[PDB]
Write a protein that binds this ligand. Sequence first.
Ligand SMILES: CCCNC(=O)N1CCC[C@H](C(=O)Nc2ccc(Cl)c(F)c2)C1
Ligand SMILES: *[C@@H]1O[C@H](CO)[C@@H](O)[C@H](O)[C@H]1NC(C)=O
Ligand SMILES: *[C@@H]1O[C@H](CO)[C@@H](O)[C@H](O)[C@H]1NC(C)=O
Ligand SMILES: *[C@@H]1O[C@H](CO)[C@@H](O)[C@H](O)[C@H]1NC(C)=O
Ligand SMILES: *[C@@H]1O[C@H](CO)[C@@H](O)[C@H](O)[C@H]1NC(C)=O
Ligand SMILES: *[C@@H]1O[C@H](CO)[C@@H](O)[C@H](O)[C@H]1NC(C)=O
Ligand SMILES: *[C@@H]1O[C@H](CO)[C@@H](O)[C@H](O)[C@H]1NC(C)=O
Ligand SMILES: *[C@@H]1O[C@H](CO)[C@@H](O)[C@H](O)[C@H]1NC(C)=O
Ligand SMILES: *[C@@H]1O[C@H](CO)[C@@H](O)[C@H](O)[C@H]1NC(C)=O
Ligand SMILES: *[C@@H]1O[C@H](CO)[C@@H](O)[C@H](O)[C@H]1NC(C)=O
Ligand SMILES: *[C@@H]1O[C@H](CO)[C@@H](O)[C@H](O)[C@H]1NC(C)=O
Length: 339
Amino acid sequence: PVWKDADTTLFCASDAKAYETEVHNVWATHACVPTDPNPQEIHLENVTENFNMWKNNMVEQMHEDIISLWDQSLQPCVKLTGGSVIKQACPKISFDPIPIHYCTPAGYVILKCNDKNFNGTGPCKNVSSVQCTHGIKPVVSTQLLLNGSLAEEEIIIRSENLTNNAKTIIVHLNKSVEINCTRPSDIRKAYCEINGTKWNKVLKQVTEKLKEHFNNKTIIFQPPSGGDLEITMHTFNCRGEFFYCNTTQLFNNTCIGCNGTITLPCKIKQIINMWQGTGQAMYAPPIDGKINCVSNITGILLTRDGGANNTSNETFRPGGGDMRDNWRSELYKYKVVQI
Ligand SMILES: CCCNC(=O)N1CCC[C@H](C(=O)Nc2ccc(Cl)c(F)c2)C1
Ligand SMILES: *[C@@H]1O[C@H](CO)[C@@H](O)[C@H](O)[C@H]1NC(C)=O
Ligand SMILES: *[C@@H]1O[C@H](CO)[C@@H](O)[C@H](O)[C@H]1NC(C)=O
Ligand SMILES: *[C@@H]1O[C@H](CO)[C@@H](O)[C@H](O)[C@H]1NC(C)=O
Ligand SMILES: *[C@@H]1O[C@H](CO)[C@@H](O)[C@H](O)[C@H]1NC(C)=O
Ligand SMILES: *[C@@H]1O[C@H](CO)[C@@H](O)[C@H](O)[C@H]1NC(C)=O
Ligand SMILES: *[C@@H]1O[C@H](CO)[C@@H](O)[C@H](O)[C@H]1NC(C)=O
Ligand SMILES: *[C@@H]1O[C@H](CO)[C@@H](O)[C@H](O)[C@H]1NC(C)=O
Ligand SMILES: *[C@@H]1O[C@H](CO)[C@@H](O)[C@H](O)[C@H]1NC(C)=O
Ligand SMILES: *[C@@H]1O[C@H](CO)[C@@H](O)[C@H](O)[C@H]1NC(C)=O
Ligand SMILES: *[C@@H]1O[C@H](CO)[C@@H](O)[C@H](O)[C@H]1NC(C)=O
């Protein structure tokens, strides 16, 4: 009387502090339950279970959770939706994401793949059962995945279908690389500092892996080929402020004096295209003084050029935009089943 694949409405849990005014804490205080006081992950002896991170309903559930979070929390000076414009108060908020656990209701469990080099689709030989996922931070980003978990063995390439150039590629790193972004005390001009030595080593490793998957062809990195600034720039939110950073220096191939510190030029933007697809939002100027965030680059989103089937190269560019891949990068090893 065991299990079968099934979709069901999950709930969430967290260590949200009831006394906090930080928006993730407020949201999870009234929309999640407390973290499981006694989590028990149970190994399944001699069991093989197949997974598919690209067809996982948990992704869509988390995505709508994060949309609701942002709709309740952020307050634009003016919002631009369709034919109208709605205008309100826009005070500065406290923004800092917290881990969110996802849990099944009665008669359901989460299966978890524990095979170290599991690429996201296919069988898994080391499977356990949990009641909740681990705490996942809902980090909204582009090009680079930040503050995520790490691949435990080798760098892993995740894709629905590597031969289709339209699908997104998720590179899951086995080594954090720090990105340290500050706006010092133009108020909107800022920058991000990255270790050149470490980054170029990791990028070399990503090229060796991509070569493994693409019949030993020459791997070339290129910047995005136009589009809105949210895709052409590494875009993220640091303590309420929307950073747009130029990553051209990260995706040149020459260091694939390139063992110093790379300094990426950034700008804090007040007017953004919402990742919700819902249009345009206008915020207030940034807080006075030093605005600083130190983050772990743990993943990379990549889109591969088409039309090079008859060439000796494959060229890749930082991608993103549809946030669901961000959640996929952390939900890949989980799946709901009905008991
Ligand atoms: C393949 C997916 C294509 N994507 C899109 O067409 N769009 C619409 C316009 C830009 C949108 C966006 O990423 N906005 C954004 C906002 C704040 C932060 Cl912090 C951030 F990281 C991102 C996403
Ligand atoms: C299976 O996963 C467990 C838990 O993550 C870990 O000890 C190891 O990777 C595997 N153990 C065995 C006995 O296969
Ligand atoms: C960054 O990565 C290190 C290990 O690579 C980890 O100990 C640290 O907690 C990470 N930072 C964040 C904010 O997750
Ligand atoms: C990370 O993965 C690469 C293979 O993708 C491997 O060569 C390297 O040794 C790994 N590093 C660590 C610290 O495990
Ligand atoms: C993951 O494994 C399956 C076969 O076991 C395959 O369909 C898929 O291409 C693999 N992923 C990668 C990145 O090779
Ligand atoms: C992958 O994509 C290519 C071209 O986009 C398509 O011809 C092929 O059938 C796809 N493979 C799978 C397994 O869906
Ligand atoms: C980040 O950079 C700023 C200035 O560039 C520096 O003051 C700060 O100590 C750095 N943080 C870390 C963790 O290295
Ligand atoms: C870069 O990382 C190396 C470790 O490989 C470290 O020794 C070095 O100090 C770092 N450089 C900078 C500028 O952070
Ligand atoms: C890639 O090259 C290595 C040696 O560099 C070779 O052993 C392997 O067969 C090649 N693989 C492909 C898919 O071309
Ligand atoms: C990023 O910087 C390069 C020069 O380093 C510049 O040519 C390019 O136009 C910049 N990207 C954008 C979107 O402005
Ligand atoms: C990543 O985590 C660190 C430590 O919790 C935090 O200071 C930083 O702002 C986070 N980065 C993002 C992009 O949220």
